Write a protein that binds this DNA or RNA. Structure first.
Ligand SMILES: [Mg+2]
Ligand SMILES: [Mg+2]
Ligand SMILES: [Mg+2]
Ligand SMILES: [Mg+2]
Ligand SMILES: [Mg+2]
Ligand SMILES: [Mg+2]
Ligand SMILES: [Mg+2]
Ligand SMILES: [Mg+2]
Ligand SMILES: [Mg+2]
Ligand SMILES: [Zn+2]
Lengths: 92, 36, 229, 146
RNA sequence: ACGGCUUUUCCGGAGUGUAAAAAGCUCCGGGAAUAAGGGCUGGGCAAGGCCGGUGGCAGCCGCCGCGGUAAUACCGGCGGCCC
RNA sequence: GCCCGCCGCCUGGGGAGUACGGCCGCAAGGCUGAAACUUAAAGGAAUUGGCGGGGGAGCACUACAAGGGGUGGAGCGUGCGGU
């Protein structure tokens, strides 16, 4: 339900790299090696192909970022119906 | 090589004989790259 | 001292001895604490020491050296047991050391105090330091050694007024025996309290194993048992 | 093994040689005499140093602890090297900004190294723009030059 | 809280001191007046089983270890300990 | 074990018997041998349990063997997951 606020933007998980590292495709047509904060790492399980919010790192904000929130099925369905995001971004 | 009989114990490590073989393989390569 | 006289009288009447030495003490054939040593008797009744050395029951003459709890493993969990190490003495010439076990702390303490009385010994005191030649029984009369487990202890005579230069366990044990000044040297693992205490106890016992001449008794002021001014 | 040797009255030379030979197996003695710490110390034997802050970072705690520790990268003025320094206190990282100058010192762990659940960090910040950081964290003082 | 006392120290003077000064020292007048901080508080290691915040976050931690909504261990109040 | 001699070797775990230099060997290799950095244990002997595709002794139709009757396929009664 919460939306990106600032430099944050959506993203689609592509492949997990191990040791809490994911490979997320963002809305600006860039692939980023993203790091999962440990606070939500322990309680929220993330799997390839999900809509998430990613904030790029302050330095070298082109290939690194942090994942802050995961969108459930109802939230992504509501977003698709509202029209803030399209279907081809999710499906690739 | 020098003997370290503490290395032959198997708890928490691989077999010493094969570590020795790996080291010797790695030393041949450095020797051959030196003469070139 | 006055209270302990009537305490000893009270214990003496309502006691039914079970052994030979107990029978001798009850009958009045043995009257002093020194008469039960150096002849091979067995000591199995704690009332003997109560009648003959009543002041080992004073609160100030007893010491709880340590308390530990140990575990035995079972398919239904861990079973806990207590071990208590204790010592007693009369602050004059006699001392004892004991260990007790139990399901709870109080039982263990009671048994440890009980076994310490059965392990009583008498020692020798005097003055043998190069820089104090005063002939008064405030230290050990000569260098002695003892050992237990990995612990080795050497006790060295010291000048009057120096204090007990030794770890705390040794301090308590030597204080209960009536010794005021000593130097020491140790080897091994002193953090194992049981072995440390036993090593000091053995070193004290070994004062009886050193051969001496009548001249030496006069020179070092050697006193056996009670000082008796 | 037999009796310790040599014990002879006229064998002083060999005895002194033996003790000198086996003293080099002592790591404390070898590092002092060869001056190994002096050759690699970025602080050059000083107890404190002055540097410039390059960026802020966060470091994860060692297992089994959980949390993030706030640190900075510092470039030393005396020799140009870059080290990492921890910022102690609750909310202390707010009083640091990029391009500030700081005074750093050792963190006080075993053998003059790191401590606790943050290995890899050997220093901590003491002053910021010539004002004590402990004061700023408690209050009682305000950071100058805005 | 009442009643009394003293003036090292503090304020204002005379002498002595000093190459000249300043300190110091002997007297005189006024008056309890002018004067306490730093660290620690789970064990090692002396000292709280109290209250309010935070909730594996923020933080502490020489070492061992605390913190996961009922924290004697973090932040603050009130107590207490060492110098 | 108690004593009288001489020589060799060791000084927490790893990095490492490695890198660099030297000598020896046709070659394969041998002898000599650091540091930056990393880490709070690594290592020994013995104890109580639990486990073994280790041994022995015993036991059970919620085990087998010898048997009697079935459930699993259809429609329906009822409980559960999912939607
Ligand atoms: Mg060995
Ligand atoms: Mg069982
Ligand atoms: Mg033995
Ligand atoms: Mg407090
Ligand atoms: Mg205490
Ligand atoms: Mg070579
Ligand atoms: Mg069955
Ligand atoms: Mg059957
Ligand atoms: Mg059916
Ligand atoms: Zn004396």
């Amino acid at each position: 339900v919460p939306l990106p606020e600032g430099n944050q933007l959506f993203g689609v998980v592509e492949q997990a790299l191990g040791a809490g590292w994911m490979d997320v495709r963002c809305e600006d047509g860039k692939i980023r090696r993203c790091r999962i904060p440990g606070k939500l790492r322990r309680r929220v399980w993330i799997r390839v192909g999900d809509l998430v919010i990613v904030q790029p790192w302050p330095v070298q904000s082109d290939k690194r970022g942090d994942i802050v929130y995961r969108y459930t099925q109802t939230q992504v369905d509501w977003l698709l119906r509202k029209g803030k995001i399209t279907q081809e971004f999710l499906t690739g | 090589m020098k003997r370290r009989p503490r290395k032959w114990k198997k708890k928490g490590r691989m077999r010493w004989k094969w570590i020795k073989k790996r080291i010797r393989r790695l030393k041949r390569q450095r020797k051959k790259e030196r003469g070139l | 001292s006055q209270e302990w006289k009537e305490y000893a009288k009270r214990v003496l009447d309502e006691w039914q001895p079970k052994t030979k030495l107990g029978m001798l003490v009850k009958e009045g054939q043995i009257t002093d604490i020194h008469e039960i040593f150096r002849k091979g008797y067995q000591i199995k009744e704690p009332e003997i020491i109560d009648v003959l050395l009543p002041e080992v029951n004073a609160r100030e003459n007893q010491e709880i050296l340590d308390i530990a709890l140990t575990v035995r493993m079972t398919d239904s969990g861990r079973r806990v047991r207590f071990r208590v190490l204790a010592a007693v003495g009369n602050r004059d010439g006699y001392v004892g050391l004991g260990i007790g076990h139990g399901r709870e702390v109080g039982i263990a303490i009671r048994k440890a105090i009980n076994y310490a009385k059965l392990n009583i010994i008498e020692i020798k005191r005097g003055c043998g330091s190069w820089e104090c030649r005063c002939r008064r029984p405030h230290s050990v009369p000569f260098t002695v050694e003892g050992k237990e487990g990995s612990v080795r202890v050497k006790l060295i005579p010291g000048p009057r007024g120096l204090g007990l230069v030794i770890g705390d366990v040794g301090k308590k044990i030597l204080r209960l025996a009536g010794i005021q000044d000593v130097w020491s040297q140790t080897l091994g693992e002193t953090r194992t309290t049981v072995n440390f205490a036993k090593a000091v106890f053995n070193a004290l016992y070994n004062t009886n194993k050193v051969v001496v001449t009548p001249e030496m008794i006069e020179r070092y002021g050697i006193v056996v048992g009670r000082a008796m001014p | 093994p037999g009796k310790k040797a040599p014990n002879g009255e006229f064998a002083g030379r060999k005895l002194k040689l033996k003790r000198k030979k086996f003293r080099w197996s002592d790591i404390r003695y070898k590092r002092r005499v060869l001056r190994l710490k002096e050759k690699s110390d970025p602080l050059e034997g000083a107890p404190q140093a002055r540097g410039i802050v390059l960026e802020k970072i966060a470091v994860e705690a060692k297992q089994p602890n959980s949390g993030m520790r706030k640190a900075v990268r510092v470039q030393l003025i005396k020799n140009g090297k870059v080290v990492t320094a921890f910022c102690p206190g609750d909310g202390a990282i707010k009083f640091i900004d990029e391009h500030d100058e700081v005074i750093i010192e050792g963190i006080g762990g075993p053998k003059g190294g790191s401590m606790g659940d943050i290995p890899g960090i050997r220093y901590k910040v003491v002053k910021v723009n010539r004002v004590s950081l402990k004061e700023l964290v408690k209050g009682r003082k305000e950071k100058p030059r805005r």
